[PDB]
Design a protein around this nucleic acid. Sequence first.
RNA 1: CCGAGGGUAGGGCCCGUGACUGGGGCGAAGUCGUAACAAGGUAGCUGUACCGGAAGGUGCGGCUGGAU
RNA 2: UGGGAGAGGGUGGUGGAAUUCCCGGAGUAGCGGUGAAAUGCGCAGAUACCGGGAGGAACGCCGAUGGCGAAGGCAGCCAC
RNA 3: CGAUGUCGGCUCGUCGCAUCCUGGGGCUGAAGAAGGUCCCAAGGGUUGGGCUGUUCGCCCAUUAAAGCGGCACGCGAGCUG
RNA 4: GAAUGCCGGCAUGAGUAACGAUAAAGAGGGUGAGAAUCCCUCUCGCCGUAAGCCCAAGGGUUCCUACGCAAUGGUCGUCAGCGUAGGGUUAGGCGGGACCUAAGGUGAAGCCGAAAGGCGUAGCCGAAGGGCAGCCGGUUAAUAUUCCGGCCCUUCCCGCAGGUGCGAUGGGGGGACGCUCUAGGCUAGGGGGACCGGAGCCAUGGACGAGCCCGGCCAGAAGCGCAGGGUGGGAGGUAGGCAAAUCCGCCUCCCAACAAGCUCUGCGUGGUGGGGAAGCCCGGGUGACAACCCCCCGAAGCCAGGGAGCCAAGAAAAGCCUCUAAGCACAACCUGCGGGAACCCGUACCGCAAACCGACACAGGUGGGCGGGUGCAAGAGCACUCAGGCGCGCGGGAGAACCCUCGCCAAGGAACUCUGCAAGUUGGCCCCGUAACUUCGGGAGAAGGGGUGCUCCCUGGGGUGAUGAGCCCCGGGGAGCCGCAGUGAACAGGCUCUGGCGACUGUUUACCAAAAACACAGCUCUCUGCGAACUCGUAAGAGGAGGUAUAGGGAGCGACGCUUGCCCGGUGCCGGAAGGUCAAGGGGAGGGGUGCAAGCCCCGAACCGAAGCCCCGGUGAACGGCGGCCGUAACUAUAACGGUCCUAAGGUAGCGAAAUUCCUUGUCGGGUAAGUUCCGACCUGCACGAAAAGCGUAACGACCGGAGCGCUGUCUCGGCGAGGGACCCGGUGAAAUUGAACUGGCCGUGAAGAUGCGGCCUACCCGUGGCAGGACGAAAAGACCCCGUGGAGCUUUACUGCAGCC
RNA 5: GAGCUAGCCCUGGCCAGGGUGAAGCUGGGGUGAGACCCAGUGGAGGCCCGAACCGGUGGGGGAUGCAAACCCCUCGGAUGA
RNA 6: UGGUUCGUGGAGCCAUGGGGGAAUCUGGGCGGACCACCGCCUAAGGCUAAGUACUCCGGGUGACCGAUAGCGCACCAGUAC
Lengths: 48, 275
Amino acid sequence: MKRTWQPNRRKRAKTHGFRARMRTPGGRKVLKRRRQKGRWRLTPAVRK
Amino acid sequence: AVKKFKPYTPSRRFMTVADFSEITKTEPEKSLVKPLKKTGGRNNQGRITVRFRGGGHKRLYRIIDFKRWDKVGIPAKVAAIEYDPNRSARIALLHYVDGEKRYIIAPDGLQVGQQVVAGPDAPIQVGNALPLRFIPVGTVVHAVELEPKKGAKLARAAGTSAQIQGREGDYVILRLPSGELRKVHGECYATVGAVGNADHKNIVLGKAGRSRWLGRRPHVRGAAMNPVDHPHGGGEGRAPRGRPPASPWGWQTKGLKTRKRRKPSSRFIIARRKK
RNA sequence: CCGAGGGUAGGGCCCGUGACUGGGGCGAAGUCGUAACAAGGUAGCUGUACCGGAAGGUGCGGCUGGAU
RNA sequence: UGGGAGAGGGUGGUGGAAUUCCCGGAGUAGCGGUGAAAUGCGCAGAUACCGGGAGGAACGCCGAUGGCGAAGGCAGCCAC
RNA sequence: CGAUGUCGGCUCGUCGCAUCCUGGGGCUGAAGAAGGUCCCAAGGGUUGGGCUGUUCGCCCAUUAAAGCGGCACGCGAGCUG
RNA sequence: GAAUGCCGGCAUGAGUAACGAUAAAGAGGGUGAGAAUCCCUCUCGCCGUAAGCCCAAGGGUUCCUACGCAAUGGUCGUCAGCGUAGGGUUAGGCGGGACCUAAGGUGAAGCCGAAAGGCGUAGCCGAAGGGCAGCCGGUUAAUAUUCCGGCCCUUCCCGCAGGUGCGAUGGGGGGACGCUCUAGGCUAGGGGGACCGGAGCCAUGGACGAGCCCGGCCAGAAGCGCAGGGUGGGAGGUAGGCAAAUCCGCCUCCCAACAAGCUCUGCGUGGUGGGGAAGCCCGGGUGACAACCCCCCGAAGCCAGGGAGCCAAGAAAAGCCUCUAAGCACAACCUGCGGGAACCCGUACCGCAAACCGACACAGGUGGGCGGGUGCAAGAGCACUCAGGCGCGCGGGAGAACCCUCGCCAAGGAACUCUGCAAGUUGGCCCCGUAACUUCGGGAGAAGGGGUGCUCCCUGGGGUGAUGAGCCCCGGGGAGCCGCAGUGAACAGGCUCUGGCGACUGUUUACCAAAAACACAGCUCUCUGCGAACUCGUAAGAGGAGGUAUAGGGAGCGACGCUUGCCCGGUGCCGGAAGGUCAAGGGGAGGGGUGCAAGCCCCGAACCGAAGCCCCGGUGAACGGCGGCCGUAACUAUAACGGUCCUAAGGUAGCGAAAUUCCUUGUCGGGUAAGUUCCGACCUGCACGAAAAGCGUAACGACCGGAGCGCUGUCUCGGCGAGGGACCCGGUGAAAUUGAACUGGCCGUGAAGAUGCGGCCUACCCGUGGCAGGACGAAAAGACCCCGUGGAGCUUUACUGCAGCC
RNA sequence: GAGCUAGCCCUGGCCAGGGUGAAGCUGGGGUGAGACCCAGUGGAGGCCCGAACCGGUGGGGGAUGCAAACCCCUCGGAUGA
RNA sequence: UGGUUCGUGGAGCCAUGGGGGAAUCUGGGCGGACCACCGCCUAAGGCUAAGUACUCCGGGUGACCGAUAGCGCACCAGUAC
Ligand SMILES: O=C(N[C@H](CO)[C@H](O)c1ccc([N+](=O)[O-])cc1)C(Cl)Cl
Ligand SMILES: [Mg+2]
Ligand SMILES: [Mg+2]
Ligand SMILES: [Mg+2]
Ligand SMILES: [Mg+2]
Ligand SMILES: [Mg+2]
Ligand SMILES: [Mg+2]
Ligand SMILES: [Mg+2]
Ligand SMILES: [Mg+2]
Ligand SMILES: [Mg+2]
Ligand SMILES: [Mg+2]
Ligand SMILES: [Mg+2]
Ligand SMILES: [Mg+2]
Ligand SMILES: [Mg+2]
Ligand SMILES: [Mg+2]
Ligand SMILES: [Mg+2]
Ligand SMILES: [Mg+2]
Ligand SMILES: [Mg+2]
Ligand SMILES: [Mg+2]
Ligand SMILES: [Mg+2]
Ligand SMILES: [Mg+2]
Ligand SMILES: [Mg+2]
Ligand SMILES: [Mg+2]
Ligand SMILES: [Mg+2]
Ligand SMILES: [Mg+2]
Ligand SMILES: [Mg+2]
Ligand SMILES: [Mg+2]
Ligand SMILES: [Mg+2]
Ligand SMILES: [Mg+2]
Ligand SMILES: [Mg+2]
Ligand SMILES: [Mg+2]
Ligand SMILES: [Mg+2]
Ligand SMILES: [Mg+2]
Ligand SMILES: [Mg+2]
Ligand SMILES: [Mg+2]
Ligand SMILES: [Mg+2]
Ligand SMILES: [Mg+2]
Ligand SMILES: [Mg+2]
Ligand SMILES: [Mg+2]
Ligand SMILES: [Mg+2]
Ligand SMILES: [Mg+2]
Ligand SMILES: [Mg+2]
Ligand SMILES: [Mg+2]
Ligand SMILES: [Mg+2]
Ligand SMILES: [Mg+2]
Ligand SMILES: [Mg+2]
Ligand SMILES: [Mg+2]
Ligand SMILES: [Mg+2]
Ligand SMILES: [Mg+2]
Ligand SMILES: [Mg+2]
Ligand SMILES: [Mg+2]
Ligand SMILES: [Mg+2]
Ligand SMILES: [Mg+2]
Ligand SMILES: [Mg+2]
Ligand SMILES: [Mg+2]
Ligand SMILES: [Mg+2]
Ligand SMILES: [Mg+2]
Ligand SMILES: [Mg+2]
Ligand SMILES: [Mg+2]
Ligand SMILES: [Mg+2]
Ligand SMILES: [Mg+2]
Ligand SMILES: [Mg+2]
Ligand SMILES: [Mg+2]
Ligand SMILES: [Mg+2]
Ligand SMILES: [Mg+2]
Ligand SMILES: [Mg+2]
Ligand SMILES: [Mg+2]
Ligand SMILES: [Mg+2]
Ligand SMILES: [Mg+2]
Ligand SMILES: [Mg+2]
Ligand SMILES: [Mg+2]
Ligand SMILES: [Mg+2]
Ligand SMILES: [Mg+2]
Ligand SMILES: [Mg+2]
Ligand SMILES: [Mg+2]
Ligand SMILES: [Mg+2]
Ligand SMILES: [Mg+2]
Ligand SMILES: [Mg+2]
Ligand SMILES: [Mg+2]
Ligand SMILES: [Mg+2]
Ligand SMILES: [Mg+2]
Ligand SMILES: [Mg+2]
Ligand SMILES: [Mg+2]
Ligand SMILES: [Mg+2]
Ligand SMILES: [Mg+2]
Ligand SMILES: [Mg+2]
Ligand SMILES: [Mg+2]
Ligand SMILES: [Mg+2]
Ligand SMILES: [Mg+2]
Ligand SMILES: [Mg+2]
Ligand SMILES: [Mg+2]
Ligand SMILES: [Mg+2]
Ligand SMILES: [Mg+2]
Ligand SMILES: [Mg+2]
Ligand SMILES: [Mg+2]
Ligand SMILES: [Mg+2]
Ligand SMILES: [Mg+2]
Ligand SMILES: [Mg+2]
Ligand SMILES: [Mg+2]
Ligand SMILES: [Mg+2]
Ligand SMILES: [Mg+2]
Ligand SMILES: [Mg+2]
Ligand SMILES: [Mg+2]
Ligand SMILES: [Mg+2]
Ligand SMILES: [Mg+2]
Ligand SMILES: [Mg+2]
Ligand SMILES: [Mg+2]
Ligand SMILES: [Mg+2]
Ligand SMILES: [Mg+2]
Ligand SMILES: [Mg+2]
Ligand SMILES: [Mg+2]
Ligand SMILES: [Mg+2]
Ligand SMILES: [Mg+2]
Ligand SMILES: [Mg+2]
Ligand SMILES: [Mg+2]
Ligand SMILES: [Mg+2]
Ligand SMILES: [Mg+2]
Ligand SMILES: [Mg+2]
Ligand SMILES: [Mg+2]
Ligand SMILES: [Mg+2]
Ligand SMILES: [Mg+2]
Ligand SMILES: [Mg+2]
Ligand SMILES: [Mg+2]
Ligand SMILES: [Mg+2]
Ligand SMILES: [Mg+2]
Ligand SMILES: [Mg+2]
Ligand SMILES: [Mg+2]
Ligand SMILES: [Mg+2]
Ligand SMILES: [Mg+2]
Ligand SMILES: [Mg+2]
Ligand SMILES: [Mg+2]
Ligand SMILES: [Mg+2]
Ligand SMILES: [Mg+2]
Ligand SMILES: [Mg+2]
Ligand SMILES: [Mg+2]
Ligand SMILES: [Mg+2]
Ligand SMILES: [Mg+2]
Ligand SMILES: [Mg+2]
Ligand SMILES: [Mg+2]
Ligand SMILES: [Mg+2]
Ligand SMILES: [Mg+2]
Ligand SMILES: [Mg+2]
Ligand SMILES: [Mg+2]
Ligand SMILES: [Mg+2]
Ligand SMILES: [Mg+2]
Ligand SMILES: [Mg+2]
Ligand SMILES: [Mg+2]
Ligand SMILES: [Mg+2]
Ligand SMILES: [Mg+2]
Ligand SMILES: [Mg+2]
Ligand SMILES: [Mg+2]
Ligand SMILES: [Mg+2]
Ligand SMILES: [Mg+2]
Ligand SMILES: [Mg+2]
Ligand SMILES: [Mg+2]
Ligand SMILES: [Mg+2]
Ligand SMILES: [Mg+2]
Ligand SMILES: [Mg+2]
Ligand SMILES: [Mg+2]
Ligand SMILES: [Mg+2]
Ligand SMILES: [Mg+2]
Ligand SMILES: [Mg+2]
Ligand SMILES: [Mg+2]
Ligand SMILES: [Mg+2]
Ligand SMILES: [Mg+2]
Ligand SMILES: [Mg+2]
Ligand SMILES: [Mg+2]
Ligand SMILES: [Mg+2]
Ligand SMILES: [Mg+2]
Ligand SMILES: [Mg+2]
Ligand SMILES: [Mg+2]
Ligand SMILES: [Mg+2]
Ligand SMILES: [Mg+2]
Ligand SMILES: [Mg+2]
Ligand SMILES: [Mg+2]
Ligand SMILES: [Mg+2]
Ligand SMILES: [Mg+2]
Ligand SMILES: [Mg+2]
Ligand SMILES: [Mg+2]
Ligand SMILES: [Mg+2]
Ligand SMILES: [Mg+2]
Ligand SMILES: [Mg+2]
Ligand SMILES: [Mg+2]
Ligand SMILES: [Mg+2]
Ligand SMILES: [Mg+2]
Ligand SMILES: [Mg+2]
Ligand SMILES: [Mg+2]
Ligand SMILES: [Mg+2]
Ligand SMILES: [Mg+2]
Ligand SMILES: [Mg+2]
Ligand SMILES: [Mg+2]
Ligand SMILES: [Mg+2]
Ligand SMILES: [Mg+2]
Ligand SMILES: [Mg+2]
Ligand SMILES: [Mg+2]
Ligand SMILES: [Mg+2]
Ligand SMILES: [Mg+2]
Ligand SMILES: [Mg+2]
Ligand SMILES: [Mg+2]
Ligand SMILES: [Mg+2]
Ligand SMILES: [Mg+2]
Ligand SMILES: [Mg+2]
Ligand SMILES: [Mg+2]
Ligand SMILES: [Mg+2]
Ligand SMILES: [Mg+2]
Ligand SMILES: [Mg+2]
Ligand SMILES: [Mg+2]
Ligand SMILES: [Mg+2]
Ligand SMILES: [Mg+2]
Ligand SMILES: [Mg+2]
Ligand SMILES: [Mg+2]
Ligand SMILES: [Mg+2]
Ligand SMILES: [Mg+2]
Ligand SMILES: [Mg+2]
Ligand SMILES: [Mg+2]
Ligand SMILES: [Mg+2]
Ligand SMILES: [Mg+2]
Ligand SMILES: [Mg+2]
Ligand SMILES: [Mg+2]
Ligand SMILES: [Mg+2]
Ligand SMILES: [Mg+2]
Ligand SMILES: [Mg+2]
Ligand SMILES: [Mg+2]
Ligand SMILES: [Mg+2]
Ligand SMILES: [Mg+2]
Ligand SMILES: [Mg+2]
Ligand SMILES: [Mg+2]
Ligand SMILES: [Mg+2]
Ligand SMILES: [Mg+2]
Ligand SMILES: [Mg+2]
Ligand SMILES: [Mg+2]
Ligand SMILES: [Mg+2]
Ligand SMILES: [Mg+2]
Ligand SMILES: [Mg+2]
Ligand SMILES: [Mg+2]
Ligand SMILES: [Mg+2]
Ligand SMILES: [Mg+2]
Ligand SMILES: [Mg+2]
Ligand SMILES: [Mg+2]
Ligand SMILES: [Mg+2]
Ligand SMILES: [Mg+2]
Ligand SMILES: [Mg+2]
Ligand SMILES: [Mg+2]
Ligand SMILES: [Mg+2]
Ligand SMILES: [Mg+2]
Ligand SMILES: [Mg+2]
Ligand SMILES: [Mg+2]
Ligand SMILES: [Mg+2]
Ligand SMILES: [Mg+2]
Ligand SMILES: [Mg+2]
Ligand SMILES: [Mg+2]
Ligand SMILES: [Mg+2]
Ligand SMILES: [Mg+2]
Ligand SMILES: [Mg+2]
Ligand SMILES: [Mg+2]
Ligand SMILES: [Mg+2]
Ligand SMILES: [Mg+2]
Ligand SMILES: [Mg+2]
């Protein structure tokens, strides 16, 4: 049957992407948090 | 004169449709239409704030002239009578000798080819607009401004009208379509006659799909729901209300008055509606 | 080939019969009330409508085959 | 051909009397109703009286023992 | 109660005997034929339907007879539901 | 040493289950250390509205070539979507951007919010919508509308020439639109040819034939032809299109009008450029100077912004054209021609799947286009086949039980069972024919029947063409032939009678319920006069609605028919300027503290003083409710009638052992040989009853009862047969579970159901196929039940607050 | 977190073939004029049969599955909510 | 209403959302309702080192760990997944 992951590059970029995150107070806490944890990627990669 | 169908489907047995007799022109004036943004009952938060709305036929909004004291003294010719899907009344296309083109609500008896006019000195004739103070007492009127220069607010639905009952100072007394007696300021405009398309009340939708065409999604009874949803929800089996009948939000809905107490327009309503 | 008739399926008319049910007629001395005949004690009767244990009552309109 | 009488019919106007309700006034101890009463209405101001307003229905006198219509039936006044 | 699946049916049996039939008896208010009642006897047998989820029961047509109980009201790591 | 402990390692189950669609394989020849599994050839089989082809998304080198086989591959492996390395994606015209706007998002102005932030007009962003210039062929191992070849075209810059009042983010036109049905003419695509081209073929009885087999086109600029879309001309006035306007709009007059004229597409032709089969011989060459023609069928595509009808009344903005304003008329614009200039990103490959979403090379899921032929009435259905693509990444044997899927069956024919569950039956088309009832539509495919192939002969009408021939499409009559059987295979209703419920088509518990539930047109009540009520929000602001009582919110009922009774004492809601109660506040009789005192300070009665509540009324399609005991008729029985107690009032019509009836399988009738169900009645209705509607109701229903006919392996009652497993051999090889085990029966005993204790009996050691009675077998720290001063959803006239409203 | 799912918003797309035969229109009849009847034409509908497509009724299989909802047969809708 | 030990308490003090609303030393606040007396202080403007806190970083030292320990990471870890 139809499953729950239906990849969509525009959707991924507009929902979790860098500029989505920076626009909002909670989004910027995500970036600050993931920088402090030292993540190699701050945001999900999508080929655009 | 509503039109009936033979019972060649279960639904055609009851369906009735308007005759569209008075209509003389079947596509709208291109410079008088603009797109009508269907809301679906959602506000600027995106929240449903009016239940059971959406999914009706696409429509274009026709611009209607609800002032008419715009063009005092400038006669106009009734060029056509057309269908308007944004309102129950039909609408009339006016060709002003000015060259300007406008739309009005189509009163009863207005014939294509006649001339109408607006102003203090207009003939008391069907389709003419005047300040209320210059219309003789007892004249059936429609498209009535509520406050001077603010725009026709009263009696716009198919078949409705207000009747001029008397004068008092700067004010006239109107019996509204509801039967309320209200004072309206004498400088407010109105149009002689009643709105047309009076048979509109006897249309039988006939089937569920017809409600859907109009943008009306199905209404769900509170007694069909669960207590999380509604005062009338729950119960083993069917159940009576078991409490004073209530809206989804808990307020009572069989007689509980709801006009705000200290409203300033109370000084201007004489008698509440009846019946 | 037609063909008595047999078989199959579906209709029409008539007759008898049926738990139960509807009123009808009849039946020396049952129970309830008193609607009508006198102005019958609310003049009567009438078409219809609604109501009532029952006759009846009431409404609307009609008739005199109503009295004083 | 030329005349006449008539609530004959249909449509739309429109006039006064009365009843009811609403507003204002003035006034107070009852009103209404019956065979007699009671229910009811009334000091939260009724009834009775005065001005104003809204609305529906029916057309007093003329009127008759009258007139018209095939019958059922048709009565303020005006026009078609 | 860190689980012993719970009615009826179907399938498959097996056992008890307080015996429904068949076998052997005594008594009889046992003429015969047919029964009644008690004793011995568990080898074998003990039917097909209508109704109801039914167990049970009633009914139909038969039969030598159409037995009554136990086996976790036998049997769901065998089926049904 | 235990915590169903934690982490890791390793056992058991076990050489067991399995190895992922039952579309299927056999042989020969290669290669190699090694071959059922790689490559080649022949034979066989499977898909063919796909299991073929082309786009989009997603994936991200998986593409091509060389060299490899440890691991990945459910076996093998020399092969590979695997390892290593090298190579491969070429654009002014295809798609996106340097263009436009949609919802939406963002947001100078402005508004709001403790902070964070929330709104918001224009504007800006935003596409698979609008707009915009490229087609055919060749080439690579791998890209091609991109490279090359042929023929075309767009924009920008500059210049030449001719022309004109040139000029815009501004005005206006246009862009610009639905659903169904549909005309004419074409194109795509297809069928046929006794015509044109072609390597060949004559078999096994016959055929050297008007034989068989193969093929018979594609693109094209101007011009021309066919068919279509679009579009009036001129003059005068002008106050409207937020300045101006010669434009548009309005009015008047003349002319033209199913045309033509101009314009714009489609198709045809077209200079020219391409392609070109079988077969044969090694992707190539030949064939070949290949031929390239006629007839028919014919779109849902094209002309297109075509036509008609209908109601539910069907985006925007730019490109483009016209108008003028600043301005400027050495300019600028328009037209024709010439030279120059023309950027960024994508392009490989998979793409109904082994490369995407499902942990897997997973029988599942994934949007658009193309989808040939013949026959079956049609069709994208069904069977078989073309092109093309596959045989599904373990095999070889055997021919037990049992399981799955499938075929048949003597006599009977529902006797099976909760139930005809399941499976039979019926089954397409044409013709005949068809009941109660009904809302006149239907019920209806009712039911029930007959016909169905092939040959010959005679004949009617249509389409193309020409009116004819030919090809193609509908038919009519007559005579014959064969079989068990002619929709000869595949696809393709069993029917009827009668109740319950719901009017109907719809909707729902993704993944145990599809229904009688929800919705539904329709009916009633109620709120709302517009800055509406109501809803979301602290607010601003939105929705309601650019609507206005024939409208919008809320509630119940639920097509339609005939109806919907009595109770307002309690609760609700509505009305009531009296009265009663009533908070802050006002008032200040009268008290008190302190000070020598002027004073400062505290308590404070009457009286005034909202909503609410009390009180007086109304109100049921508001919440709701609608009695008991006793007596009575000239047979009996039963009470039309009466007495009395109580109530706010004592259930009307209609229906009733019912989706409701406890006693109950009530009683009587029907149907049956027999009927706890069914149907029809009765009425002592435990405990129907009128919009939580009452009683009916044609049509409808994968709803739930009862019956009959048809037919059956459901059954008496089983038998046989097929294939996939099970079994055996070679390859690969799990699992839950598991205190350890050297793990028998009886009768007892034991914490009360013992392989493990007692006594007796029985029993050589170890396996393999089977069956499920036990190991209180496995699974899941019982869901039921209780307990915990455990939790959570829900309710209200429980308590106590809060929003909201007064 | 609405790339699953529910509703709405904007913009596109899809629904083989066959059957039934409403209104209207025309001609005819009818009448004072009408209503209305008959024939043809027409092509309506939460109309009918049935693929695609969307579903998920009954049964069987599957149950350490091909699959954490699948497979076979059968069945509902298929111009419309 | 908050703050303080102060939860309305005899409830002052400090702060302030609402209403009313002064004076300039003979002015004004405080000493726990209030009054007197005795005293303390000078609101409605602003700044101001040091002593105090913390440990991303550097170093020194452990009756601190020694690869299941010590940081999640001794190792290409905020990685693979
Ligand atoms: O609850 C069950 N069984 C338990 C065993 O743990 C027990 O046997 C039981 C069975 C039936 C029962 N009953 O019928 O009331 C009660 C307990 C099973 Cl139904 Cl799961
Ligand atoms: Mg899904
Ligand atoms: Mg998606
Ligand atoms: Mg994307
Ligand atoms: Mg996208
Ligand atoms: Mg997206
Ligand atoms: Mg977002
Ligand atoms: Mg983003
Ligand atoms: Mg912040
Ligand atoms: Mg890095
Ligand atoms: Mg992130
Ligand atoms: Mg109708
Ligand atoms: Mg009809
Ligand atoms: Mg009209
Ligand atoms: Mg526009
Ligand atoms: Mg809006
Ligand atoms: Mg918004
Ligand atoms: Mg938002
Ligand atoms: Mg609402
Ligand atoms: Mg809504
Ligand atoms: Mg409206
Ligand atoms: Mg209208
Ligand atoms: Mg006014
Ligand atoms: Mg209505
Ligand atoms: Mg609509
Ligand atoms: Mg509605
Ligand atoms: Mg509803
Ligand atoms: Mg409910
Ligand atoms: Mg519910
Ligand atoms: Mg909720
Ligand atoms: Mg709640
Ligand atoms: Mg609630
Ligand atoms: Mg309730
Ligand atoms: Mg309920
Ligand atoms: Mg319920
Ligand atoms: Mg109940
Ligand atoms: Mg009920
Ligand atoms: Mg209740
Ligand atoms: Mg309530
Ligand atoms: Mg409210
Ligand atoms: Mg009112
Ligand atoms: Mg004979
Ligand atoms: Mg007597
Ligand atoms: Mg009498
Ligand atoms: Mg009498
Ligand atoms: Mg009397
Ligand atoms: Mg009398
Ligand atoms: Mg009476
Ligand atoms: Mg009094
Ligand atoms: Mg008084
Ligand atoms: Mg009135
Ligand atoms: Mg237990
Ligand atoms: Mg356990
Ligand atoms: Mg267990
Ligand atoms: Mg004897
Ligand atoms: Mg025996
Ligand atoms: Mg039992
Ligand atoms: Mg019994
Ligand atoms: Mg015997
Ligand atoms: Mg027994
Ligand atoms: Mg027992
Ligand atoms: Mg028992
Ligand atoms: Mg058992
Ligand atoms: Mg079981
Ligand atoms: Mg059982
Ligand atoms: Mg078991
Ligand atoms: Mg067991
Ligand atoms: Mg221990
Ligand atoms: Mg464990
Ligand atoms: Mg543990
Ligand atoms: Mg342990
Ligand atoms: Mg562990
Ligand atoms: Mg381990
Ligand atoms: Mg290790
Ligand atoms: Mg191991
Ligand atoms: Mg082992
Ligand atoms: Mg084993
Ligand atoms: Mg296994
Ligand atoms: Mg498997
Ligand atoms: Mg298969
Ligand atoms: Mg072979
Ligand atoms: Mg082979
Ligand atoms: Mg091999
Ligand atoms: Mg090998
Ligand atoms: Mg090969
Ligand atoms: Mg095919
Ligand atoms: Mg991937
Ligand atoms: Mg390998
Ligand atoms: Mg290997
Ligand atoms: Mg491997
Ligand atoms: Mg595998
Ligand atoms: Mg090798
Ligand atoms: Mg490549
Ligand atoms: Mg190019
Ligand atoms: Mg540029
Ligand atoms: Mg901000
Ligand atoms: Mg954007
Ligand atoms: Mg853009
Ligand atoms: Mg675009
Ligand atoms: Mg382009
Ligand atoms: Mg081209
Ligand atoms: Mg090409
Ligand atoms: Mg090369
Ligand atoms: Mg347009
Ligand atoms: Mg438009
Ligand atoms: Mg469009
Ligand atoms: Mg439509
Ligand atoms: Mg072509
Ligand atoms: Mg063809
Ligand atoms: Mg002008
Ligand atoms: Mg075009
Ligand atoms: Mg050559
Ligand atoms: Mg199409
Ligand atoms: Mg088109
Ligand atoms: Mg716009
Ligand atoms: Mg100038
Ligand atoms: Mg110059
Ligand atoms: Mg020009
Ligand atoms: Mg650039
Ligand atoms: Mg490419
Ligand atoms: Mg597929
Ligand atoms: Mg593949
Ligand atoms: Mg997942
Ligand atoms: Mg595979
Ligand atoms: Mg072909
Ligand atoms: Mg066919
Ligand atoms: Mg295979
Ligand atoms: Mg397959
Ligand atoms: Mg074997
Ligand atoms: Mg199979
Ligand atoms: Mg067969
Ligand atoms: Mg045979
Ligand atoms: Mg048989
Ligand atoms: Mg039979
Ligand atoms: Mg038979
Ligand atoms: Mg049976
Ligand atoms: Mg049986
Ligand atoms: Mg059942
Ligand atoms: Mg049945
Ligand atoms: Mg068939
Ligand atoms: Mg019949
Ligand atoms: Mg019939
Ligand atoms: Mg019938
Ligand atoms: Mg019937
Ligand atoms: Mg009929
Ligand atoms: Mg038939
Ligand atoms: Mg024949
Ligand atoms: Mg033949
Ligand atoms: Mg023969
Ligand atoms: Mg069928
Ligand atoms: Mg239904
Ligand atoms: Mg239902
Ligand atoms: Mg019903
Ligand atoms: Mg009904
Ligand atoms: Mg449907
Ligand atoms: Mg479910
Ligand atoms: Mg569920
Ligand atoms: Mg679930
Ligand atoms: Mg199910
Ligand atoms: Mg259910
Ligand atoms: Mg259903
Ligand atoms: Mg539901
Ligand atoms: Mg319904
Ligand atoms: Mg109503
Ligand atoms: Mg709110
Ligand atoms: Mg609020
Ligand atoms: Mg609006
Ligand atoms: Mg209904
Ligand atoms: Mg109804
Ligand atoms: Mg409903
Ligand atoms: Mg209901
Ligand atoms: Mg009451
Ligand atoms: Mg009351
Ligand atoms: Mg009350
Ligand atoms: Mg009560
Ligand atoms: Mg009644
Ligand atoms: Mg009964
Ligand atoms: Mg009943
Ligand atoms: Mg009951
Ligand atoms: Mg019973
Ligand atoms: Mg019972
Ligand atoms: Mg019985
Ligand atoms: Mg009987
Ligand atoms: Mg009885
Ligand atoms: Mg109720
Ligand atoms: Mg009827
Ligand atoms: Mg019916
Ligand atoms: Mg249904
Ligand atoms: Mg159903
Ligand atoms: Mg039968
Ligand atoms: Mg069998
Ligand atoms: Mg076999
Ligand atoms: Mg091996
Ligand atoms: Mg292996
Ligand atoms: Mg041991
Ligand atoms: Mg041992
Ligand atoms: Mg052992
Ligand atoms: Mg042993
Ligand atoms: Mg014991
Ligand atoms: Mg024992
Ligand atoms: Mg032992
Ligand atoms: Mg021992
Ligand atoms: Mg011992
Ligand atoms: Mg022992
Ligand atoms: Mg022993
Ligand atoms: Mg023994
Ligand atoms: Mg073995
Ligand atoms: Mg074994
Ligand atoms: Mg066992
Ligand atoms: Mg067992
Ligand atoms: Mg066991
Ligand atoms: Mg145990
Ligand atoms: Mg056990
Ligand atoms: Mg479990
Ligand atoms: Mg636990
Ligand atoms: Mg427990
Ligand atoms: Mg548990
Ligand atoms: Mg317990
Ligand atoms: Mg407690
Ligand atoms: Mg306790
Ligand atoms: Mg608790
Ligand atoms: Mg709680
Ligand atoms: Mg609060
Ligand atoms: Mg989604
Ligand atoms: Mg369709
Ligand atoms: Mg037909
Ligand atoms: Mg026809
Ligand atoms: Mg027509
Ligand atoms: Mg349909
Ligand atoms: Mg049909
Ligand atoms: Mg589904
Ligand atoms: Mg299924
Ligand atoms: Mg079945
Ligand atoms: Mg499962
Ligand atoms: Mg399936
Ligand atoms: Mg199937
Ligand atoms: Mg079907
Ligand atoms: Mg269908
Ligand atoms: Mg269809
Ligand atoms: Mg404090
Ligand atoms: Mg204090
Ligand atoms: Mg303050
Ligand atoms: Mg001074
Ligand atoms: Mg001082
Ligand atoms: Mg002082
Ligand atoms: Mg102070
Ligand atoms: Mg102090
Ligand atoms: Mg001090
Ligand atoms: Mg100072
Ligand atoms: Mg100081
Ligand atoms: Mg400091
Ligand atoms: Mg250090
Ligand atoms: Mg280590
Ligand atoms: Mg470590
Ligand atoms: Mg350690
Ligand atoms: Mg570190
Ligand atoms: Mg670690
Ligand atoms: Mg790493």
